[PDB]
Design a protein around this nucleic acid. Structure first.
Ligand SMILES: [Mg+2]
Ligand SMILES: [Mg+2]
Ligand SMILES: [Mg+2]
Ligand SMILES: [Mg+2]
Lengths: 188, 36, 128, 67
RNA sequence: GGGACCGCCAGUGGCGAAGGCGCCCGGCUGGAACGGGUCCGACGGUGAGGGCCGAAGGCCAGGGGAGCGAACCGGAUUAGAUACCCGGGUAGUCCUGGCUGUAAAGGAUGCGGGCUAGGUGUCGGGCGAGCUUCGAGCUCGCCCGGUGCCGUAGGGAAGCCGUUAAGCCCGCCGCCUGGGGAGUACGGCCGCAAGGCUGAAACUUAAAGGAAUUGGCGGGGGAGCACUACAAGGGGUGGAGCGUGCGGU
RNA sequence: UGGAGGUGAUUUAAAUGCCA
RNA sequence: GCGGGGUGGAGCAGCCUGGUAGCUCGUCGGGCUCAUAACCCGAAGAUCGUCGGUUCAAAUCCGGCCCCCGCUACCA
């Protein structure tokens, strides 16, 4: 059918900071329409080594220049079955939800999680949480936006919470889980 | 109603809840019904 | 490149089943098939048989327009109701690949609430 | 239409009147030709017969562990 | 754009006088356990009448009305079905100031003190040895506190309790004295209402109630059968006239 | 050895019975 | 001014579209249970008020007569 057979195959790009690597094919007629659809892909597909298979990412387009939608970051999500495989009995998860902003002004909301080895009472728990918020605050003052999203999802901050939180009690699989954007700044 | 719990046993009788409700429909009466 | 791809949402139930074959971003539908379209009886509206039939015919459409391989997204009504998938899952996905379209990442996206709203019934259940 | 498949094991008898029979057989030819499936048959059967079927994709429904 | 709960870790796990109490951060705030060659100097137990708190439900107003929804309107089901099933939907649930003071409010066990075997986990604290990525960590003993199970002396009609007595000793308190008629009657006391606290008698009957023991049964669960059971097959009676046995007249 | 607790499930239409 | 059905013991179905009164409660009787009721099935059962017309042919379309008769001229 023409309604079908009048479509037109635009292409998407990885956002610039990841290094442009093409992903996906999308059909559409007129360039005014496909400007607020979103994408999900893994990390493995964009220069990804397998063992980062359980990471999941999001871009939203922002422009249509002649069969090219250059994307823009939107968020990041982990695999629900994956974390489901961590929280078992006698484990006592630890939650942390935080608001930060960035040098260049992007303000974001992150939700990072730890898991101890045993059960522990709060007065040896909440300190962990305070420690996480601290060693993230300091972090998010020196970095641009694009670079911040780079290294957390690279898998880097984990190796630091899983360093200064051990100094209270031994633990396993410390890391950040989901990242959602809030707005975008006025400058530039 | 100053309960007496030997009656709920439902042995050779009827439920208690649904007897209370019916005694109300007569105390409300002999109070209202020209008991003035 | 030349890799045309797409996403198939598959929505199950106790009472019917639904297949939705879509573009990559998910906003542009391609082909839609149900259970109430092929078979008739309402005993077998949930059978695996209608599941297969409609779920082969779905591929038999979306295979011409250009879709090649597919990712899967399975889902139950969930939410404020039952959390169990219908038995039609392997009634579609076992047979879908058998229709020649490839397979990529496969996942269910069952919606669960953190203490959602009130279920039906109430203090005595579906008192059959 | 004429597809034959070969019986390679009898597994049990189900049916409200003890009539069907759980029997894991192998297809011998076709787009499958080598996949071994699960079906219930009617009549008497021996290990080593040559059965015809007509769908090669039905995947009969499981039993209560044969016992 | 809204309104209403805070999933999985979650533990005979903690906290409270009892009802209750579970997303996160800052302030305010009561109590208990532990460790203490600290201080005051019998200052205590109970408690009639008295005084406070007290899930849900109803009601006074004002706000809020997502989902859930007696009342109420439909289709079903049915011998009927004002009940079970289904599609809708008023009051309520929700927020502020109130009166109501009702529960299987159940450890169905009031509250304080002394004593009388041993075993076995687990939360807090502490003391002692070991390790230890040296961490506010991980093992193992021993002392004092709450929460669990098995079981001696003894105790009970037996279910069963066993230092968290239903054992043995010293205190104070409230109720019960066949069963119903009955929590009714008449009278007073608080309530805005609905109702709540106090509570007899005439007469009628020979017993109602508890704990365990065999068996029958179960539209309870397992094990195992049979052509007077079914499945799979073969042949029939019921329908005609007649032989022959009962019913009845 | 025996339980002692918890989460889910748990099925059409099936009324009644002199006399010693 | 009219105008309607003119139907088995009972609801009257069915009427321009034309050949089987058409099912349903009830009456006889036969089945299942141990026995009853529910449940099942054969039977009885009027044959369209009635004289007609139209109609090869009928309630079926149109009329004589008559059964019972159901709506005929209200807001201080
Ligand atoms: Mg008593
Ligand atoms: Mg007193
Ligand atoms: Mg039923
Ligand atoms: Mg009978």
């Amino acid at each position: 059918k023409d309604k079908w057979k009048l479509k037109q195959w635009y292409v998407i790009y990885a956002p610039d900071f990841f290094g442009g690597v093409e992903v996906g094919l999308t059909p559409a007629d007129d360039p005014e329409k496909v400007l607020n659809r979103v994408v999900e892909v893994t990390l493995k597909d964009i220069t990804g080594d397998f063992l980062k298979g359980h990471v999941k990412l999001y871009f939203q387009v922002y422009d249509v220049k002649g069969q090219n939608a250059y994307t823009k970051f939107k968020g990041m999500k982990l695999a629900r079955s994956y974390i489901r495989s961590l929280v078992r009995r006698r484990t006592t998860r630890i939650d942390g939800i935080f608001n930060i902003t960035t040098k260049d002004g992007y303000k974001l909301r992150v939700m990072a999680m730890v898991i101890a080895a045993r059960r522990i009472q709060t007065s040896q728990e909440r300190a962990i949480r305070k420690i996480m918020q601290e060693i993230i605050y300091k972090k998010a003052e020196e970095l641009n936006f694009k670079d911040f999203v780079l290294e957390a999802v690279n898998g880097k901050i984990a190796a630091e919470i899983a360093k200064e939180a051990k100094k209270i009690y031994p633990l396993k699989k410390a890391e950040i889980r989901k990242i959602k954007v809030l707005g975008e700044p006025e400058v530039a | 109603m100053k309960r007496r719990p030997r009656k709920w046993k439902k042995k050779g009788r009827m439920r208690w809840k649904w007897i209370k409700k019916r005694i109300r429909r007569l105390k409300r009466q002999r109070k209202k019904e020209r008991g003035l | 490149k030349k890799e045309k791809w797409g996403i198939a949402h598959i929505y199950s139930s106790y009472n019917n089943t639904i297949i939705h074959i879509t573009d990559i971003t998910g906003a542009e539908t391609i082909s839609r098939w149900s259970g109430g379209m092929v078979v008739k009886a309402d005993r077998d509206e949930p059978s695996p048989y209608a599941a297969m039939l409609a779920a082969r015919r779905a591929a038999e459409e979306a295979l011409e327009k250009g879709i090649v391989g597919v990712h899967i997204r399975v889902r139950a009504p969930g939410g404020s109701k039952s959390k169990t998938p219908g038995p039609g899952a392997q009634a579609a996905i076992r047979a879908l690949a058998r229709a020649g379209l490839k397979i990529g990442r496969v996942e269910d996206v069952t919606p669960i609430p953190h203490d959602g709203t009130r279920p039906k019934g109430g203090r005595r259940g579906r008192r059959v | 239409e004429g597809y034959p498949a070969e019986v390679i094991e009898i597994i049990g008898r189900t049916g409200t009147t003890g009539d069907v029979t759980q029997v894991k057989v192998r297809i011998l030819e076709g787009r499958d030709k080598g996949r071994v499936i699960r079906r219930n048959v009617r009549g008497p059967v021996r290990v080593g017969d040559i059965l015809i079927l007509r769908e090669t994709e039905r995947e009969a429904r499981e039993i209560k562990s044969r016992r």
